[PDB]
């Protein structure tokens, strides 16, 4: 079957068997083994044994450190050049640019980054040949979604990073059972290299292999391929998360009639035992993880977490919008995480957790800005840069984007349906972001079409547009994504969720937050809940429905300045509509659906009557 030894890499397999793999998977592995030239091939089985040995191996090499204070928890410190998902190096390849991003009138799209097939081929050839020399290629069979669920999708990731292997074991369902469920089915092809073949051409920093100059995270949806080079971090390297479950998946979703979104999913139960599920899209750094795992301050209310970051949603036969969490764990921002802001996260992460770029205490615990836990006198701190640190220093002890990576099943409020194969029925969708001025705590959209316009108008900070929290994550043209959302209104018998917009971040004139937030947000969720039940608790305004006077439970919060928090200004909202106008005109133009344009004019009109 070959004249020499062919593309047959059996001799280099140190775990599992190429014979055992489905034909197409074997082909994927062996093709990239020939290209990348790894010294060893490790087919992951997902076992506890494989995992313990992987960690020991990394520990042995100084790639990770054990955090002796906790049960099976580990710390990685990275090269300071590789500390986040990196948008500027993130691209989607399609035949025509306009299928990927709308053509901006001012020459630069904030809605994606296209690369031609030709330019990518050249970039690929400049990077991958021999890139794994001297390393192990790990083969990670993973399912996004509960194994065997009709909403689940399988990928194979090849990586030269054991850190990616460990993190993927947490954040996806990984191992032999996935290969068995796969059979001879289709899978997303995920290729990753840290881009540092041996012998090293450049010095290794903090035992963290990366290639910042050649970093390139590419998606080729027409080939069902994700190809990522040069970063070992987060969304650049854990390919199932953003690359697959948002970018690749949002385009599949458009073609197939479902949705793949940057949304938490939570189940909330009232004092009468009535439960509803909600989904919420907030941009990175705007508090999805706090809400998803909320400990409600209101007596007799309960919040349970389905997922904190990504939602796959599809209408069922009865018109219910069903959502699954395609993730298996939580990859949450560590700083700011405290008993006060996220007690349930505090409990989840003290075992079987990997931390990246946090500080370490001298008794082997973790530390970060906003942890709000004083240390005993004499306990000292090693920063994420691996030097002694004191609370007086200029720099933070933890990187602002440092993360924990923790099993979802350990969360004390994990939803009983968090793995149900049919998904949970969504009754409300919440949008929101950071709006220091002008936008009140909570409003309700007037219609599905107004709701989609409200998603389109979202912000990650007072000055930055992040429609639907998907700005860095659209798998195709944003204009067509709006058309896809609007199309859900025409699905016969669809039970369309109520759409709300929240704002935790309104400030008074001295910069102080007007709303205490966190667990207190339960008071906003109570209102949404009654609204879905059709309670007469809403007052119409030009921006949507707001809570009536007295509608919100504010007991315990008498110091809240209700007039400023809930206030609507004609002058603010005139500015807002003009801003939205310019933005949509510049960024979306020819691709903007009629309905979005009509909502813009309708809001303008309502404001004009103030
Ligand atoms: N004022 C206020 N801040 C909040 C609230 N909830 C979350 N935050 C802030 O939001 C940040 C934490 O949110 P992140 O974990 O970064 O957000 P995320 O949406 O989960 O982001 P990704 O994991 O990157 O998708 C911190 O600055 C928190 O203080 C709230 O109710 N009020
Ligand atoms: O940036 C985000 O929204 C994240 O959830 C982190 S990463 O998975 O993109 O690293
Ligand atoms: Mn998060
Ligand atoms: Mn996210
Ligand atoms: Na390190």
Q: Which residues contact 286 (CB under 8 A, 6 or more apart)?
A: 432, 433, 434, 460, 469, 505
Active-site residue (options: 286, 305, 397, 405): 286
CB 112 within 8 A of CB 478: yes
Give the sign of the dihedral formed by CA 294, CA 500, CA 246, CA 126: negative
Query: Whose atoms come closest to the Cα of 356: which ligand?
Result: 5
Tell me if residue 36 is catalytic.
no
Nearest atom, ligand 2, residue 84 CA: 10
> Sign of torsion, CA 407 413 419 423?
negative
- Euclidean distance between CA atoms 129 and 35, whole angstroms: 5
Nearest atom in ligand 1 to the alpha carbon of residue 520 is: 31
Beta bridge partners of 451: none
Q: Which residue has the tokens 């189940």?
A: 267
Q: What is the Cα–Cα distance from 609 to 239, expressed in whole angstroms?
A: 49
**For ligand 1, atom 6, which residue shows the shortest CA distance?**
287
Query: For the sheet containing 366-367, what is the strand order?
Result: 366-367, 359-361, 381-382, 388-389
Ligand in nearest proximity to the CA of 310: 4
Please write down the long-range contacts of 12-16, taking CB distance under 8 Å and 24 or more positions apart. 12/38, 12/39, 12/40, 12/41, 13/40, 13/41, 13/42, 13/43, 14/40, 14/41, 14/42, 14/136, 15/42, 15/43, 15/44, 15/45, 15/50, 16/42, 16/43, 16/44, 16/45, 16/139
Residue 2's φ and ψ, nearest 5 degrees, are -155, 160
Ligand 1 interacting residues, C-beta cut-off 6 A: 282, 284-290, 309, 332-333, 336, 341, 504-505, 513, 517-518, 521
Question: Dihedral sign, CA of 307, 310, 314, 315?
Answer: positive
Q: Taking Cα atoms as reference points, which of 196, 198, 160, 206 lies closest to residue 62? A: 206
Cα separation, 309 vs 330, whole angstroms: 8
> Rounded to an integer, what distance in angstroms lies between the CA atom of residue 354 and that of residue 76?
8
Whole-angstrom Cα distance, residue 198 to residue 36?
Answer: 12
Tokens, residue 410: 């350990």
Resolution of this model in Å is 1.7
As a whole number of angstroms, the distance between CA 167 and CA 605 comes to 50
The full set of domains in the chain, from first to last, is 9-62+86-257 (3.40.449.10), 63-85+328-412 (2.170.8.10), 258-327+413-610 (3.90.228.20)
Between the CA of 516 and the centroid of ligand 3 the distance, in Å, is 20
Rounded Cα distance, 249 and 259, in Å = 8
- φ, ψ dihedrals at 597, nearest 5°: -55, -40
Please enumerate in sequence order all residues whose Cβ is within 8 A of that of 444, keeping only pairs 6 or more positions apart, or say none: 498, 499, 500, 528, 531, 538, 544, 545, 546
Ligand 2: distance of its center to the CA of 136 in Å?
A: 26
């Amino acid at each position: 079957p070959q004249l020499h030894n062919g593309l047959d890499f059996s001799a280099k397999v140190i775990q599992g068997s190429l014979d055992s793999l489905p034909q197409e998977v074997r082909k994927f592995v062996e093709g990239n083994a020939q290209l990348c030239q790894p010294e060893y091939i490790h087919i992951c089985d997902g076992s506890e044994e494989e995992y313990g040995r992987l960690l020991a191996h990394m520990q042995e090499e100084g790639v990770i450190r054990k955090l002796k204070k906790y049960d099976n928890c580990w710390l990685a410190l990275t090269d300071p050049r590789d500390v986040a998902r990196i948008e500027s190096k993130t691209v989607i390849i399609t035949q025509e640019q306009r299928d990927t991003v709308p053509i901006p009138k001012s020459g630069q799209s904030q809605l994606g980054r296209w690369m031609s097939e030709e330019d990518f081929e050249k970039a690929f050839n400049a990077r991958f040949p021999g890139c794994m020399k001297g390393r192990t290629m790990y083969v990670i069979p993973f399912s996004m979604g509960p194994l065997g669920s009709p909403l689940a999708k399988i990928g194979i990731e090849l990586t030269d990073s054991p850190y990616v292997v460990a993190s993927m074991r947490i954040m996806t369902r990984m191992g032999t059972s996935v290969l068995e469920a796969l059979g001879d089915g289709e899978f997303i092809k995920c290729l990753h290299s840290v881009g540092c073949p041996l012998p090293l051409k450049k010095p290794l920093v903090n035992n963290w292999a990366c290639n910042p100059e050649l970093t390139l995270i590419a998606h080729l949806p027409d080939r069902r391929e994700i190809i990522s080079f040069g970063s070992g971090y987060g969304g650049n390297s854990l390919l199932g998360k953003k690359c697959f479950a948002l970018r690749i998946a949002s385009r599949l979703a458009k073609e197939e009639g479902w949705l793949a979104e940057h949304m938490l999913i939570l189940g909330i139960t009232n004092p009468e035992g009535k439960k509803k599920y909600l989904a919420a899209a907030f941009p990175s750094a705007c508090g999805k993880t706090n809400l998803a795992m909320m400990n409600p301050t209101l007596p007799g209310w309960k919040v349970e977490c389905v997922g904190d970051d990504i939602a796959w949603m599809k209408f069922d036969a009865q018109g219910n919008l069903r959502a699954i969490n395609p993730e298996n764990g939580f990859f949450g921002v560590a700083p700011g995480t405290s008993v006060k802001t996220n007690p349930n996260a505090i409990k989840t992460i003290q075992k079987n957790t990997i931390f990246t770029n946090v500080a370490e205490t001298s008794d082997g615990g973790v530390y970060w800005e906003g942890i709000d836990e004083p240390l005993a006198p004499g306990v000292t701190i090693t920063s994420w840069k691996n030097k002694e640190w004191r609370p007086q220093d200029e720099e933070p002890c933890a990187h602002p984007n440092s993360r924990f990576c923790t099993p979802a099943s350990q969360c004390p409020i994990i939803d009983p349906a968090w793995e149900s194969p049919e998904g949970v029925p969504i009754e409300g969708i919440i949008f929101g972001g950071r709006r220091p001025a002008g936008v009140p705590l909570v409003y309700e959209a007037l219609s599905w079409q107004h709701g989609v316009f409200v998603g389109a108008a979202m912000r990650s900070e007072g000055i930055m547009h992040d429609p639907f929290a998907m700005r860095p994550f659209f798998g195709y043209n944003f204009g067509k994504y709006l058309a896809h959302w609007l199309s859900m209104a025409h699905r016969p018998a669809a039970k369309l969720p109520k759409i709300f917009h929240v704002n935790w971040f309104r400030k008074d004139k001295n910069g102080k937050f007007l709303w205490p937030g966190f667990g207190e947000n339960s008071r906003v969720l109570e209102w949404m809940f009654g609204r879905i039940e059709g309670e007469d608790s809403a007052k119409l305004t030009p921006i949507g429905y707001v809570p009536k006077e007295d509608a919100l439970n504010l007991k315990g919060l008498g110091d809240v300045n209700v007039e400023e928090l809930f206030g609507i200004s004609k002058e603010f909202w005139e500015k807002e509509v003009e801003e939205i106008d310019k933005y949509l005109e510049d960024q979306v133009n020819a691709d903007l659906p009629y309905e979005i344009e009509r909502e813009l004019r309708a809001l303008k009109q309502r404001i004009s009557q103030m």
